[PDB]
Write a protein that binds this ligand. Sequence first.
Ligand SMILES: *Cc1[nH]c(Cc2[nH]cc(CCC(=O)O)c2CC(=O)O)c(CCC(=O)O)c1CC(=O)O
Length: 294
Amino acid sequence: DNVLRIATRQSPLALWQAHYVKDKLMASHPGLVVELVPMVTRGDVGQGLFVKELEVALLENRADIAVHSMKDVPVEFPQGLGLVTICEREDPRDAFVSNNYDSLDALPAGSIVGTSSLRRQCQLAERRPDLIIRSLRGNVGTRLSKLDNGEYDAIILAVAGLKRLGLESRIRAALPPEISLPAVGQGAVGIECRLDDSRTRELLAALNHHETALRVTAERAMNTRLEGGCQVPIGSYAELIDGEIWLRALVGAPDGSQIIRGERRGAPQDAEQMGISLAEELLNNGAREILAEV
Ligand SMILES: *Cc1[nH]c(Cc2[nH]cc(CCC(=O)O)c2CC(=O)O)c(CCC(=O)O)c1CC(=O)O
């Protein structure tokens, strides 16, 4: 056949990811014809907001692969499909963006921060209960627009997003993982395809970044047991510290009153199980009730 079709969302960032992948494929395979098949998603207008339609495209042979930001990828996959490649992770941190202010601790009480992330919301409320967390929706550019239009005093966004769009000057301060634990796989893009499609699987191999896969498998094992998605206040971030996966996670109330934290450290080979163990520790420590709450 020699043709690989790529299903992707049609926002500026989504298209950046499609081209990123397309280039790495052409690099390793000079004579491969890569076709982009952009499409809209429910979230742009199961929990398949930004993914369902790409999965339908994969199941109908309308595309061969689907490109997503790892944090948008669902934990459940329909019969036949699955995540097969995890690319090199970019900066996984959240970032404080603002025009008139230089930092979070410099915002006066009452300042309006924008984010619809319950994960980001719970952590800020825990430290700065005097701040107003206002919901924000839309592509990066629309979010930046609203901030410039004075609708919010500041907004929180992923560092990986702004950097890739050449808007890294908007990053007023990259928040440390300790102060804002990243969402699962933030900073990494994942490729989904038909498990039986060996042809596509082999062509995709060269794009897999082993270390990043290790980190994200652990983070996702944690989330999968917790059966969460973007709509739940869950933090999950792993690092490769001296040949060992150091996994951290949290589940907190939107108001920031109760936040359940936990950590685990072990050999790379036990990434999935350590994530599963950590998740259960959180469940028994009250996460179950907090999650049932939301
Ligand atoms: C799961 C989830 N998705 C989003 C929206 C989103 N998805 C990808 C990006 C770009 C960064 C990346 O590639 O990882 C973004 C926007 C961004 O974070 O800059 C969210 C955020 C919703 C919000 O903050 O209003 C979430 C939930 C979460 O991050 O916890």
